[PDB]
Amino acid sequence: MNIFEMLRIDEGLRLKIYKDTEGYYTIGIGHLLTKSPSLNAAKSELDKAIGRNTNGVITKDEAEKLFNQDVDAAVRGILRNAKLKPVYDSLDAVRRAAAINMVFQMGETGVAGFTNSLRMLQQKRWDEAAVNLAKSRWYNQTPNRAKRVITTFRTGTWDAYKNL
Template identity: 30%
Template sequence: MDLKNRLISYEGSIAYQTKVGYFKNGKFCTYKDSLGYPTIGYGRLLKPGESYPNGITPEQAERMLEEDISTAKSAVRSLGLNLPADWQDFMTIMVFQLGLSGTLKFRKMIQALRDKNYKEAILQAKDSLWYRQTKSRVDQMIAELTNN
C-alpha cells in the first residue's frame, strides 16, 4: 500500500469516518483527535483560527493530505538521514503524526537510524509514550519495514 493510502487507513477512511460521525452529507466535519485537538479530513490538525464550519469535500481532504505528506517528507529530509525507502515512509508517517518537533525527541532512534542499526531504531520507537498511545498504528508501521 502506498504512503497516502496507508495514512488514509491510519487516520480513518470515509467509511470509518461515516460510521463514527465525522463524515456526513458528503463532507468531512471537524472532530477532536485523541489528544483533543481539532482535526479534519485525513488527520489535518487545524491551526489556531482555522475553521471549516461547513466541512470539506473528499477532494479537499485529499489535497490537504498530499500537502501534509509533502511537508512531512521535507521535514524528514531535513534530518539528513540516508534512509532506505521503507524507513523514509516510516519517518514520514511519524512526522505526519508527531510533527518534526515531536520526532526530534526520539534522539536515540534517530542516532540508531544514522548508524543503520534498524533493530535498535525499532526498540527505541517502541520505548515511547507514542508507542503506548498508538500501539496498533506503530506495530503496523513496523510490520511494513523490510530493513529491520
C-alpha cells in the same frame, strides 16, 4: 502500498470536524486544525485552509487536497531539518515512508526526542531501532499504529499494512 495509502489507513477519512487521538480538532485525513479547545477557532482554521466559509464540513476532494499538502509539508520539514535529513537520506523508500508517517503524526520537533532511535536507524540496526522506538509516549498512546510503523522500520516491507 505507498505513503499516501499508508497514512490513509492510519488516519482514516472524516469529512466533518472531529477530535484526534489527543483530543484536538482535526478534519479529513488527519489534518490537524488547532490545539485550541475552541471549536470556533478550529472552524476558522478550516476556512483559512480550504479558502471558503465551510459549515465545518468539507468534500472528499478538499480532504485529499489538504492531505497532499500535509504529506508534502512533512517531507519538506524532514529535508530542512539537520538531524532528520541525513537519516532520511540513508533509508530505502519503504522506510522513508515510515519516517514521513511519524513526522505527519507528531511534527518535526515532535520527533526531537528520538535522537537514539535516529542513530540506530542510520546504523541500520533495525531490531535495536525497533526496540528503542517503542520506548516512547508515542507507542504507549497509539500502540497499534506505532507497531505498524515500527514493523515497517524493522523489516523494510509493507507487511504491517497488508489486508488493511
